[PDB]
């Protein structure tokens, strides 16, 4: 199950944050699994004219030249278990 | 979190096989999740420390520098759906 990405703008409350969404283009149709962002407090992503709420950020640290960095993983509302492991499978390969 | 690993090993069947094994490590404790081989239809992966039994292989293709390619995927017996997803999400990135 290959996993793709699409940079997108999310929203918190007064927080408005851009970031990278993880999706899945099975045949013609799309499906967003998770959203990786650097600002917490984020509430909703707007995906397609359709809104998507997010979840309690799980926290972790990803490296780089400019330094390993705090990061915030958001699973979309009620993502089935199998796809959650699938998300963590992708990240913990590209780290 | 986080962190999934790889280590080549030999697996047996009622009959032998060899291939990739996706595994994990925590506070020193070494966990095995899945085994990948081009050969059906093995039973066990022996890990020198247990007789770890394998599920019937799920089957998949990957594109290569020499065309199309068969490999089988064996989850371990009764592996929790969560950890099943990472195996699949990992491979997904890992190969094509």
Swiss-Prot record, chain B:
It comes from the Viruses. Residues 1-96 form the Nsp9 ssRNA-binding domain. It is found in: Host cytoplasm, Host perinuclear region; Host cytoplasm; Host endoplasmic reticulum. Homodimer. Forms a primer, NSP9-pU, which is utilized by the polymerase for the initiation of RNA chains. Interacts with ribosome signal recognition particle RNA (SRP). Together with NSP8, suppress protein integration into the cell membrane, thereby disrupting host immune defenses. This is Viral protein genome-linked nsp9. It comes from Porcine epidemic diarrhea virus (strain CV777) (PEDV). The lineage of its organism: Viruses, Riboviria, Orthornavirae, Pisuviricota, Pisoniviricetes. The gene is rep. The chain holds residues 3863 to 3963 of 6781 of the full protein.
């Amino acid at each position: 199950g290959k996993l793709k990405q699409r940079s997108i703008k999310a929203e918190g409350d007064g927080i408005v944050g851009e970031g990278k969404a993880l999706y899945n283009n099975e045949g013609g149709r799309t499906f967003m699994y998770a959203f990786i962002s650097d600002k917490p407090d984020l509430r909703v992503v707007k995906w397609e004219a359709n809104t998507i709420e997010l979840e309690p950020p799980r926290k972790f640290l990803v490296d780089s030249p400019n330094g390993a960095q705090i990061k915030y993983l958001y699973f979309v509302r009620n993502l089935n278990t199998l796809r959650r492991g699938a998300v963590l499978g992708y990240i913990g390969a590209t780290v």
